[PDB]
Design a protein around this ligand. Structure first.
Ligand SMILES: Nc1nc2c(ncn2[C@@H]2CN(C(=O)CCP(=O)(O)O)C[C@H]2OC[C@@H](O)P(=O)(O)O)c(=O)[nH]1
Ligand SMILES: Nc1nc2c(ncn2[C@@H]2CN(C(=O)CCP(=O)(O)O)C[C@H]2OC[C@@H](O)P(=O)(O)O)c(=O)[nH]1
Ligand SMILES: Nc1nc2c(ncn2[C@@H]2CN(C(=O)CCP(=O)(O)O)C[C@H]2OC[C@@H](O)P(=O)(O)O)c(=O)[nH]1
Ligand SMILES: Nc1nc2c(ncn2[C@@H]2CN(C(=O)CCP(=O)(O)O)C[C@H]2OC[C@@H](O)P(=O)(O)O)c(=O)[nH]1
Ligand SMILES: [Mg+2]
Ligand SMILES: [Mg+2]
Ligand SMILES: [Mg+2]
Ligand SMILES: [Mg+2]
Lengths: 187, 183, 183, 176
């Protein structure tokens, strides 16, 4: 197979290495949310921001030995008004209220941490029982944000990577692995 | 119009416009040094769809330049009618960062959706945030939001007209009154 | 007030209200005996955010009971400008199946987004579907969809006022005029 | 187990699902062998299916998601909570469904996307029920034809639960 002949210069994470780590995260999450959630009577809620972390959440929930529910949000940026925001525009809000719920924010990659900071603070205002963050990838510039990511899959260098949900102009998401683009693509 | 549905007229069309002209004049004076000081005008944020009739008259009563902004929200439970947490179906079109913002309501009853809205918009970091409502019920007088501009203080009866509805009707009324028999 | 922004005034506030007053009676006569026969009211569907100021005056000019509906639409870019296919940010709150619906626009320029919109609402199978716009540009007479009610015929120039904007400004004007290109 | 006493019988096992998706991916890849194949998915039942489907399709695929709500208790007209991010003009579009039962929401959707004038528009569903024979849509790709019983698992839910199941099975009537 191939799909994108030459666009991928180097391979950061292989497909097996990704799935192996996800299996580890599931057991870890499964142990942290064992006892509690199934007795509470309300499952572990997985809130996902469209649409990079869709491939990640489908594998994660099936890696978590505890029953999990899905929830999806669609957000867009208010343009360049990012730097002093970090407020993002909501295109599709939560379907139901998350009051008294154990909620796990599932992202695929955390770079700046500003859209995540607003999202995490936004969900907190809805008063859930628990709120933690699980990301597949974390880049160096996340150390400059104020949010604690309880579950991290991989710490990668500050390079633009695609694959496994990660895109460049809506492409390379269907890749099973995560790698770096070859700069003769940006044109 | 609506024969035999309207029992009494609480507020006439004349009383509404007279107050809005007065309310508009008050707001226009409070936000007078805004064009010359920031240069972004006063933003009127409106929640669909009751206060749509009110803002069109309110903004045209305010002598200083005003901008329009609309939100569409829905109730979850049980959740809203106790928490005040509301669902967003349409967020703001632009960022209100560093803006002088006026939340324009048609009626404030419990004051919790207003509480959630005011707290939500605050996270967007505006320069100033005040609330202007046309009607105010008794339970709102003791809520967690400060309403700088109030049009009328009304008793807690279910009233329709001037944007206020019952099953999407009576919105087009120019006066505000109460329903009676088999409605 | 906008002291150095309005070069010329195309339509005065009196002329605007006069046509709307005429349109309300005209629409009111075309939709006479509708509530008592169907059992439903005339639904006014509005596209945010130009015709929001227009419908509040239009509905209050129509002597028969009317209901409100609002849509928020966005451009895909490139493809809207030449297709007219638009993104939906806010759909109708209720279904319009078997309803007599009046599409209310603020201005009809190309007629491409209106044509797509008309087809979208038609697929929901309403009883009737007509279009009422306050302003119509010369190149809008071109093709597709019947605009049953037109308030004014304006030249194809960019005008602001009475809901019409330039970067969310000049909306609060009671009149419709032309901007000075040094804006 | 995951839900002790809720799953009475297993209709399709996890391995049987992935094996069939592998065939669907291979079949679709040959039919669409100019940009990428656009996979339009309706939130949120078919999210587990499309992620596995796209990784089964040997040709490059792009993702798109819609959120729709029902107006109530006829024509398949649904309220749009989340529209497409981009226009699909001249695009090869594949509608990815989780289950096709009545075929009424799919028909409104298929006709709606057709109005955006794509180059191609096809429908791929994992499961199809017997009453779909009366639908208005031609479904080119079907994973399984299942009986008219209420099934959960692999995206399919009951009060937002059992979505995380890797298999598809039937519920225990002391759940309703
Ligand atoms: N492909 C790809 N994207 C990245 C990367 N890094 C940041 N992105 C996207 C750009 N970005 C930010 O700059 C904000 C980081 P944070 O606020 O911490 O979530 C969010 C990242 O997700 C892109 C979303 O728009 P999407 O899921 O809809 O595609 C990266 O290495 N690779
Ligand atoms: N007709 C009509 N309605 C009222 C009244 N009072 C509260 N409503 C509606 C119910 N309500 C609240 O409970 C909010 C109270 P707060 O805590 O201050 O946010 C606001 C009104 O909701 C109607 C909106 O859905 P709408 O804008 O789409 O019409 C009232 O006198 N008369
Ligand atoms: N201010 C101001 N705008 C104009 C004018 N003319 C076309 N516009 C905007 C561009 N336009 C179209 O191309 C519509 C084509 P049709 O399918 O016939 O409805 C409508 C106007 O768009 C602005 C609305 O989205 P808005 O209400 O959110 O501001 C004009 O004189 N003056
Ligand atoms: N759990 C579970 N659901 C089913 C089943 N069957 C139909 N559903 C849901 C209800 N349904 C239909 O009756 C078919 C309508 P059409 O598109 O015309 O074929 C679509 C199914 O999806 C429900 C969505 O609200 P969801 O994706 O958010 O879960 C079934 O066996 N099991
Ligand atoms: Mg991206
Ligand atoms: Mg109401
Ligand atoms: Mg405009
Ligand atoms: Mg379901």
């Amino acid at each position: 197979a191939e799909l994108y002949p030459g666009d991928i210069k180097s391979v950061l994470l292989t497909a097996e290495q990704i799935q192996a780590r996800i299996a580890e995260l599931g057991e870890q999450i499964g142990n942290d949310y064992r006892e509690l959630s199934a007795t509470t009577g309300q499952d572990l809620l997985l809130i996902t921001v469209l649409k990079g972390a869709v491939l990640f959440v489908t594998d994660l929930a099936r890696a978590i030995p505890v029953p999990t529910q899905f929830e999806f949000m669609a957000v867009s940026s208010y343009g360049s008004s990012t730097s002093s925001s970090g407020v993002v525009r909501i295109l599709k809000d939560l379907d139901r209220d998350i009051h008294g719920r154990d909620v796990l924010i599932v992202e695929d990659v955390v770079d700046s941490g500003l859209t995540l900071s607003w999202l995490s603070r936004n969900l907190t205002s809805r008063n859930p029982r628990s709120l933690r963050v699980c990301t597949l990838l974390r880049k160096p510039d996340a150390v400059h944000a104020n949010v604690e990511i309880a579950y991290v899959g991989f710490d990668i260098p500050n390079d633009f990577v695609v694959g496994y949900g990660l895109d460049y102009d809506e492409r390379y998401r269907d890749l099973s692995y995560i790698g770096t683009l070859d700069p003769r693509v940006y044109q």
